[PDB]
Amino acid sequence: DIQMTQSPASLSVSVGETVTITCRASENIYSNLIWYQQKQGKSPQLLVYAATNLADGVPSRFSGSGSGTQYSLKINSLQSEDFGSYYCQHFWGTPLTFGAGTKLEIKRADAAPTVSIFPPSSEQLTSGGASVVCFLNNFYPKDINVKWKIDGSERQNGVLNSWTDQDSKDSTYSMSSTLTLTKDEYERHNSYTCEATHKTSTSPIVKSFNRNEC
Amino acid sequence: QVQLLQSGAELVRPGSSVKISCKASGYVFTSYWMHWVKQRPGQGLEWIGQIYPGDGGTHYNGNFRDKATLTADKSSSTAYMHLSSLTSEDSAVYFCARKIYDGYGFSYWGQGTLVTVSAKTTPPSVYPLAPGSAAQTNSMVTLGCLVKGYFPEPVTVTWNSGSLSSGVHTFPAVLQSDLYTLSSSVTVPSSPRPSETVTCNVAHPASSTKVDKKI
Amino acid sequence: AFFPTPSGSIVTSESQLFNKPYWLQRAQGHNNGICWGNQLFVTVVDTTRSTNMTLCTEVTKEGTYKNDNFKEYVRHVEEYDLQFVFQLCKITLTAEIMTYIHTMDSNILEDWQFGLTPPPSASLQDTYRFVTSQAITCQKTAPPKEKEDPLNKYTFWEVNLKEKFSADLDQFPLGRKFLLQSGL
Amino acid sequence: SNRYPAQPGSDNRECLSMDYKQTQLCLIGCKPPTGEHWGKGVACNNNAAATDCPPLELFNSIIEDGDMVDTGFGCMDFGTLQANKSDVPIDICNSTCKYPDYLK
Amino acid sequence: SNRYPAQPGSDNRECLSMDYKQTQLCLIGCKPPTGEHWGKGVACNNNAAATDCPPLELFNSIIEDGDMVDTGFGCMDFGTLQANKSDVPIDICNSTCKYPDYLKMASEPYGDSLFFFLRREQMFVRHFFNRAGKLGEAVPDDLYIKGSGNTAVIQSSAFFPTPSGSIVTSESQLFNKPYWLQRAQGHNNGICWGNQLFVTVVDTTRSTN
């Protein structure tokens, strides 16, 4: 097989900039590349064939380039209909391989998160559980790391996370982070918190709760 | 007019065999090779094979060798793939591929087919989540509602049955131990709490337990 | 149960029947060239110029051959040409002639649009003419339809020559060959 | 060399290609030319020791465009006279090649 | 004999040798002699075509020197329509073999490409080979009856003949004999405008190696 190394993993861009996605293989394929567009909840759609030739219906912002072992596509004045997830595909070889996939995201100025911690629900305590959840809401960028802590000592196991897609309104993300623990582990320790690292503040977001307080 | 119909959702058990098919029209079926593909979630596509309805000459991938049996039928104008002894790492989406008669790349696709492997379905339960008595009164108070532990998709959750619901990030269902867990948290001004006392309703296109809880 | 396979032989360039003039001076019937109804029916068969060029369309291209990377067609092309030369001839239409053409065809004499023809001169029998509008003993009411031609069911290569006449011959191939025969 | 015994089997049908008898002709006229072909017809009343044999009769028609000419397989119908459909090539398999009557 | 079922493997390309149809011709002109060939063109790309067959188009070009003559395989461009480059003999792999159009030059009113023309061709078939690959239009169902077992795969029926030549005598030559232009066929009865003439020959009875 000839594997493909598509880079970057994503890009934050606004309307108008000149964009470039890297697409590189192992063997000299002779300009037999296909680029593609996928939006959310949708199927791929034909953009360019044989790395220079456009198929029908498309505007002239897309332009292909490159020869040899490297190729890249150029879009000038990028528009709101172009946002989605991408794939560059070579088509010689047993077997055919595809692109790594870049999700073409929107650019926005950064805003610090609004994160709020909660004590667990009393309905789980009767059945015998206690789920500790830290909701990470309305920040930027998507990359963020969350720290779970018990009695000042951090915990790595049982951590379950959730990310959402980019909102189409203000280009935000909202993250749900969950730590799951039993009934007997819950009543013994009293200090639990989440501390999320970010670029907007050097110190992490401090949100804690105690069982004796509430 | 050319079209490739595809069934969207398909639920199965691990270690069994499932018959996935897509329908062909708008062109003459015997004049084109057909390919099938797999996009691993969190990964790119993977090409599996190459099949012709005219003679039946097959082609597989070596990493799919003995895993899929590419066979078709020409009367009803459809092609099949049939994964044998399915495991959890092939829980993914699938299309069947149509190129131009030249055949550089794939011009038309199908719709998609996501497969999931599990033993039994289970209905969830909804839990109310109240804030803490710390974190003193600023402008916005963020609430909580948490459904947990269900199979399968889909599930709907609405605040006040859709009355005041504007600005809630309904979080995606994460699958851990064949049960999905979803969450939702509303942003709201501080004054209608505890005035309106917003509720969290669950509707389930399934066994269909409709539960309401006060937040 | 036997059957043989015919093949045919070499095809020269002197055993042809086309690309040549053919004058007529005496047809083998009593119709000495005249075409009533202003149409002809020319039919030819050739099996000598019957080649079959074959196409080749590729799938995926690289310098190591695999036989499934190509998908071929089979096509075949044939053309023709027709050329004519016609001659204006008149019919004097008197009493003893229209009785002759009437027995050959009806469609000729109506298509000069100069009169109508009562088909009998009367008949002898009563033919049992009813008037009471059909409620006693059913008869075959036989609604007619002329249908304007008999050949309209079939399919031909229709060619038109309504806009391709000329009066000056020698600006064409056939005129320059025909005039050298006649000496005019 | 067609020796003995015959090799048994359910089907020995294969792929072959053959050529055609070369022919050139030309007919004109004021009324379109008429051709003919053999064709299966009607039998008679009940006959005791008669074998199963389809009767053969003449049919006159008008030579439509596209129909084939004879090619050394006789001027006969091929649709309703071959059940197996595997004796002539594709170009004459379900078609009825005629031939004009120079006598009539 | 072509037995069932199919024996071979992935690629079964062969090495073979043939010859061509013998062709003698001779022309005379003051303008150069034109000619044509079958070549590709554009299609109608608003209709949802069931098959997307390459359309074909006639091209009246002007004959250059070194362009090959018809070799019985038809007058097409083998450069762009034989993508596998490996189904015609070597010499005709990457060019176009034109053929004259007599019925066009004669119908030109000034008649300044033909003063005199002659031709002799003959051809028959020696062997029969079938091509390989997948048929574009596979055969429809109601003209055959299927089977089972060794009759599983339909054999690809792309048949092509081979040209064979013939005998070549010396009674049927066309050269070393004079030709007096008693009367040309067009209107230009021998006049050579612009102080030039264009003769052309294609002879392939004297082509030893």
mmCIF file with all atom_site columns, C-alpha atoms in Angstrom, chain A residues 34 36 38 43-44 46 49 87 89 91 93 95-96 98-100 116 118-119 121 123-124 131 133 135 137-138 160-164 172 174-176 213, chain B residues 37 39 43-47 61 95 104-107 109-110 127-134 142-144 146 148 169 171-172 174 176 183-185 213:
data_model
loop_
_atom_site.group_PDB
_atom_site.id
_atom_site.type_symbol
_atom_site.label_atom_id
_atom_site.label_alt_id
_atom_site.label_comp_id
_atom_site.label_asym_id
_atom_site.label_entity_id
_atom_site.label_seq_id
_atom_site.pdbx_PDB_ins_code
_atom_site.Cartn_x
_atom_site.Cartn_y
_atom_site.Cartn_z
_atom_site.occupancy
_atom_site.B_iso_or_equiv
_atom_site.pdbx_formal_charge
_atom_site.auth_seq_id
_atom_site.auth_comp_id
_atom_site.auth_asym_id
_atom_site.auth_atom_id
_atom_site.pdbx_PDB_model_num
ATOM 1  C CA . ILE A 1 34  ? -9.011  13.519 -5.894  1.00 0.00 ? 34  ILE A CA 1
ATOM 2  C CA . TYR A 1 36  ? -13.380 15.936 -1.459  1.00 0.00 ? 36  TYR A CA 1
ATOM 3  C CA . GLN A 1 38  ? -17.921 16.532 3.649   1.00 0.00 ? 38  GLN A CA 1
ATOM 4  C CA . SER A 1 43  ? -22.078 12.479 2.146   1.00 0.00 ? 43  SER A CA 1
ATOM 5  C CA . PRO A 1 44  ? -18.907 13.458 0.224   1.00 0.00 ? 44  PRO A CA 1
ATOM 6  C CA . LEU A 1 46  ? -16.824 15.691 -6.049  1.00 0.00 ? 46  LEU A CA 1
ATOM 7  C CA . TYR A 1 49  ? -10.368 15.189 -10.518 1.00 0.00 ? 49  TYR A CA 1
ATOM 8  C CA . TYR A 1 87  ? -10.154 14.216 2.137   1.00 0.00 ? 87  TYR A CA 1
ATOM 9  C CA . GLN A 1 89  ? -7.423  10.649 -2.302  1.00 0.00 ? 89  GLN A CA 1
ATOM 10 C CA . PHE A 1 91  ? -6.188  6.285  -6.778  1.00 0.00 ? 91  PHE A CA 1
ATOM 11 C CA . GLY A 1 93  ? -2.655  0.968  -5.929  1.00 0.00 ? 93  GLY A CA 1
ATOM 12 C CA . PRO A 1 95  ? -5.177  -1.067 -2.106  1.00 0.00 ? 95  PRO A CA 1
ATOM 13 C CA . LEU A 1 96  ? -6.408  2.511  -2.539  1.00 0.00 ? 96  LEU A CA 1
ATOM 14 C CA . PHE A 1 98  ? -7.394  8.073  1.438   1.00 0.00 ? 98  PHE A CA 1
ATOM 15 C CA . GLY A 1 99  ? -6.687  11.297 3.283   1.00 0.00 ? 99  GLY A CA 1
ATOM 16 C CA . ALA A 1 100 ? -6.233  11.765 7.009   1.00 0.00 ? 100 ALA A CA 1
ATOM 17 C CA . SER A 1 116 ? -19.537 25.254 36.713  1.00 0.00 ? 116 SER A CA 1
ATOM 18 C CA . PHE A 1 118 ? -21.927 20.332 40.647  1.00 0.00 ? 118 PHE A CA 1
ATOM 19 C CA . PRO A 1 119 ? -22.499 17.941 43.557  1.00 0.00 ? 119 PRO A CA 1
ATOM 20 C CA . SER A 1 121 ? -27.605 13.697 42.187  1.00 0.00 ? 121 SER A CA 1
ATOM 21 C CA . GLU A 1 123 ? -31.286 9.689  42.721  1.00 0.00 ? 123 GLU A CA 1
ATOM 22 C CA . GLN A 1 124 ? -28.059 7.772  42.054  1.00 0.00 ? 124 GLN A CA 1
ATOM 23 C CA . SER A 1 131 ? -21.368 10.638 39.140  1.00 0.00 ? 131 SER A CA 1
ATOM 24 C CA . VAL A 1 133 ? -19.495 15.937 36.297  1.00 0.00 ? 133 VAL A CA 1
ATOM 25 C CA . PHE A 1 135 ? -19.252 21.020 32.441  1.00 0.00 ? 135 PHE A CA 1
ATOM 26 C CA . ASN A 1 137 ? -18.963 25.628 28.386  1.00 0.00 ? 137 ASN A CA 1
ATOM 27 C CA . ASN A 1 138 ? -18.371 28.282 25.727  1.00 0.00 ? 138 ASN A CA 1
ATOM 28 C CA . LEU A 1 160 ? -15.226 9.900  30.559  1.00 0.00 ? 160 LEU A CA 1
ATOM 29 C CA . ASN A 1 161 ? -15.410 12.919 28.244  1.00 0.00 ? 161 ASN A CA 1
ATOM 30 C CA . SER A 1 162 ? -17.646 14.439 25.563  1.00 0.00 ? 162 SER A CA 1
ATOM 31 C CA . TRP A 1 163 ? -17.034 17.107 22.912  1.00 0.00 ? 163 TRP A CA 1
ATOM 32 C CA . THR A 1 164 ? -19.589 18.800 20.685  1.00 0.00 ? 164 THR A CA 1
ATOM 33 C CA . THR A 1 172 ? -18.118 27.991 20.044  1.00 0.00 ? 172 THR A CA 1
ATOM 34 C CA . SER A 1 174 ? -19.077 23.019 24.746  1.00 0.00 ? 174 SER A CA 1
ATOM 35 C CA . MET A 1 175 ? -17.404 20.177 26.584  1.00 0.00 ? 175 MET A CA 1
ATOM 36 C CA . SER A 1 176 ? -18.832 17.665 29.030  1.00 0.00 ? 176 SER A CA 1
ATOM 37 C CA . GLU A 1 213 ? -21.352 22.436 52.938  1.00 0.00 ? 213 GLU A CA 1
ATOM 38 C CA . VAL B 2 37  ? -15.634 1.574  1.583   1.00 0.00 ? 37  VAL B CA 1
ATOM 39 C CA . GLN B 2 39  ? -14.694 5.096  7.376   1.00 0.00 ? 39  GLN B CA 1
ATOM 40 C CA . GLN B 2 43  ? -10.094 7.894  11.046  1.00 0.00 ? 43  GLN B CA 1
ATOM 41 C CA . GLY B 2 44  ? -10.250 8.251  7.266   1.00 0.00 ? 44  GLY B CA 1
ATOM 42 C CA . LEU B 2 45  ? -11.931 5.932  4.780   1.00 0.00 ? 45  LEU B CA 1
ATOM 43 C CA . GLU B 2 46  ? -10.696 2.402  4.019   1.00 0.00 ? 46  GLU B CA 1
ATOM 44 C CA . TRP B 2 47  ? -11.239 0.821  0.594   1.00 0.00 ? 47  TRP B CA 1
ATOM 45 C CA . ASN B 2 61  ? -8.407  -6.184 0.261   1.00 0.00 ? 61  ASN B CA 1
ATOM 46 C CA . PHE B 2 95  ? -20.909 3.400  1.397   1.00 0.00 ? 95  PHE B CA 1
ATOM 47 C CA . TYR B 2 104 ? -10.919 8.079  -11.966 1.00 0.00 ? 104 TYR B CA 1
ATOM 48 C CA . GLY B 2 105 ? -12.830 8.812  -8.764  1.00 0.00 ? 105 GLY B CA 1
ATOM 49 C CA . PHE B 2 106 ? -16.190 8.213  -7.169  1.00 0.00 ? 106 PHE B CA 1
ATOM 50 C CA . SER B 2 107 ? -18.761 10.616 -8.565  1.00 0.00 ? 107 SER B CA 1
ATOM 51 C CA . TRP B 2 109 ? -22.153 7.757  -3.398  1.00 0.00 ? 109 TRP B CA 1
ATOM 52 C CA . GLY B 2 110 ? -24.991 6.226  -1.425  1.00 0.00 ? 110 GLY B CA 1
ATOM 53 C CA . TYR B 2 127 ? -31.734 12.342 36.990  1.00 0.00 ? 127 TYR B CA 1
ATOM 54 C CA . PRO B 2 128 ? -32.232 15.938 38.134  1.00 0.00 ? 128 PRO B CA 1
ATOM 55 C CA . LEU B 2 129 ? -29.120 17.984 38.894  1.00 0.00 ? 129 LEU B CA 1
ATOM 56 C CA . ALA B 2 130 ? -29.250 20.999 41.207  1.00 0.00 ? 130 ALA B CA 1
ATOM 57 C CA . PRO B 2 131 ? -26.418 23.539 41.624  1.00 0.00 ? 131 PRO B CA 1
ATOM 58 C CA . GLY B 2 132 ? -24.355 24.107 44.744  1.00 0.00 ? 132 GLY B CA 1
ATOM 59 C CA . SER B 2 133 ? -24.970 26.614 47.517  1.00 0.00 ? 133 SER B CA 1
ATOM 60 C CA . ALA B 2 134 ? -21.516 28.064 46.830  1.00 0.00 ? 134 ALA B CA 1
ATOM 61 C CA . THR B 2 142 ? -26.185 26.991 34.842  1.00 0.00 ? 142 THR B CA 1
ATOM 62 C CA . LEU B 2 143 ? -28.423 24.019 35.621  1.00 0.00 ? 143 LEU B CA 1
ATOM 63 C CA . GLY B 2 144 ? -28.157 20.291 34.976  1.00 0.00 ? 144 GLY B CA 1
ATOM 64 C CA . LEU B 2 146 ? -28.411 13.864 32.968  1.00 0.00 ? 146 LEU B CA 1
ATOM 65 C CA . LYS B 2 148 ? -27.587 7.680  31.396  1.00 0.00 ? 148 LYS B CA 1
ATOM 66 C CA . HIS B 2 169 ? -25.876 22.820 24.340  1.00 0.00 ? 169 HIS B CA 1
ATOM 67 C CA . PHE B 2 171 ? -24.214 17.175 24.372  1.00 0.00 ? 171 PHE B CA 1
ATOM 68 C CA . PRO B 2 172 ? -23.519 14.219 22.052  1.00 0.00 ? 172 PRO B CA 1
ATOM 69 C CA . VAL B 2 174 ? -20.922 8.963  24.223  1.00 0.00 ? 174 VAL B CA 1
ATOM 70 C CA . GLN B 2 176 ? -19.089 3.427  26.948  1.00 0.00 ? 176 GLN B CA 1
ATOM 71 C CA . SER B 2 183 ? -26.080 15.491 29.259  1.00 0.00 ? 183 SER B CA 1
ATOM 72 C CA . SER B 2 184 ? -27.590 18.960 28.911  1.00 0.00 ? 184 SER B CA 1
ATOM 73 C CA . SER B 2 185 ? -27.079 22.252 30.761  1.00 0.00 ? 185 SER B CA 1
ATOM 74 C CA . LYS B 2 213 ? -38.047 15.370 36.655  1.00 0.00 ? 213 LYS B CA 1
#
